Design a protein around this ligand. Structure first.
Ligand SMILES: O=c1cc(O)n([C@@H]2O[C@H](COP(=O)(O)O)[C@@H](O)[C@H]2O)c(=O)[nH]1
Ligand SMILES: O=c1cc(O)n([C@@H]2O[C@H](COP(=O)(O)O)[C@@H](O)[C@H]2O)c(=O)[nH]1
Lengths: 219, 218
């Protein structure tokens, strides 16, 4: 499994190239894994992945929540890996064929798929929560090894870890700004994803170091 | 929304030169183009302004927005800054995520399309069972624009029943995926068509032919 420094993944959702680069550079000593999503990619282009790889010693997870038909999923993954992303995040709710399309490209291209099985925000309760156990089990059946589950619902996160087993790799957003607790989350997740708590802080470095100190015994 | 010939081109080619050439070849038949991540992630968001400059077409950004509300807001803002007229959003992540998109669209004078049910076989596993409830959620939220599948006309008809005749409904899956243009337009306002046109030996003749086959529905 990828070796995530300090069990901490920066969610770089600033939409300005200069700011994203400044903040990411400032926390570089604490984090070697960066999640880049559409807020930044749609603002600055896929070349932002190239610039991050040039500037920092960071793994790149493309948080694109892939959610299309299999044929379109295939193209999205091909474009994303071509640009230099190490991994891509895909939704499981569109079903098994859509997930397998992504797995097949990642296999061909030598990269990784993460499966998002359940989400951290209130709206996740309406439709996703009820499908989550089955989406997770479908992931296991398809051979998915990397997963995403919510920091804001420890009870649900614990169940996800059960389903996927101790050998699978699990990352979790929702600590900090959304109210999730880093320590409790790391009881089940391999790494926490953290965005605003860090990138909106007056001192992103101090904020990152503070999170890390709070979980020191877990490293 | 007034779509020429009830036909929306899904431009999923991933090369700028081919995308522009093929769109130019069928321009006389359409005035609405769906641009998705295959083209955008390959060529950049500047392609949206390039299409408007070359064709003056309306642009629907098919980004299947499916994140938390805060991120959805950022995605729509970036998308509309690029010149998109409309954006397609998933309903499965729930109401707050959809409302986030509605807010930005209102702020920038754009439209949100709610994808309530999909066209491919995997849609049966999780989406189909939620689809009616997602459509009702759209109605509750004041959504007026919807997306549903040409490959399942009985499901598309049910979607039309829920949203009413006043809402706008577009539908992918005709052609390559096996849907029928004429049957689909019994329920949808417009059909979305990609491969049947953009992979055809002669895209212009392909578009013309589809239109010929539905000429009585125009
Ligand atoms: O269920 C999920 C899945 C996500 O990818 N995310 C993503 O994780 C990040 C969380 O950032 P933040 O720490 O600012 O709340 C955002 O990029 C968001 O899109 C989430 O918040 N909840
Ligand atoms: O349920 C859906 C929703 C879609 O947006 N689409 C999109 O509609 C287009 C269909 O293209 P095609 O005519 O080549 O099958 C693709 O861009 C696809 O991503 C779909 O096929 N099914």
């Amino acid at each position: 499994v990828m070796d995530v420094m300090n069990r901490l993944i920066l969610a770089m959702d600033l939409m300005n190239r200069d700011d994203a680069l400044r903040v990411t550079g400032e926390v570089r000593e604490y984090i070697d894994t960066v999640k880049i999503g559409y807020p930044l990619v749609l603002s600055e282009g896929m070349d932002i992945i190239a610039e991050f790889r040039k500037r920092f010693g960071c793994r790149i997870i493309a948080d694109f929540k892939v959610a299309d038909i299999p044929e379109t999923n295939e193209k999205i993954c091909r474009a994303t890996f071509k640009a230099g992303a190490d991994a891509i995040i895909v939704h499981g709710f569109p079903g098994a064929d859509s997930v397998r399309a992504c797995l097949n490209v990642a296999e061909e291209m030598g990269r990784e798929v993460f499966l998002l099985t359940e989400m951290s925000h209130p709206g996740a309760e309406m439709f996703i929560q009820g499908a989550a156990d089955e989406i997770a089990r479908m992931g296991v059946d398809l051979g998915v090894k990397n997963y995403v589950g919510p920091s804001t619902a420890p009870e649900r996160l614990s169940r996800l870890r059960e389903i996927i087993g101790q050998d699978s790799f699990l990352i979790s957003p929702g600590a900090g700004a959304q109210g999730g607790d880093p320590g409790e989350t790391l009881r089940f997740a391999d790494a926490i994803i953290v965005g605003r708590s860090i990138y909106l802080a007056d001192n992103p470095a101090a904020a990152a170091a503070g999170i890390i100190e709070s979980i020191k015994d877990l490293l």
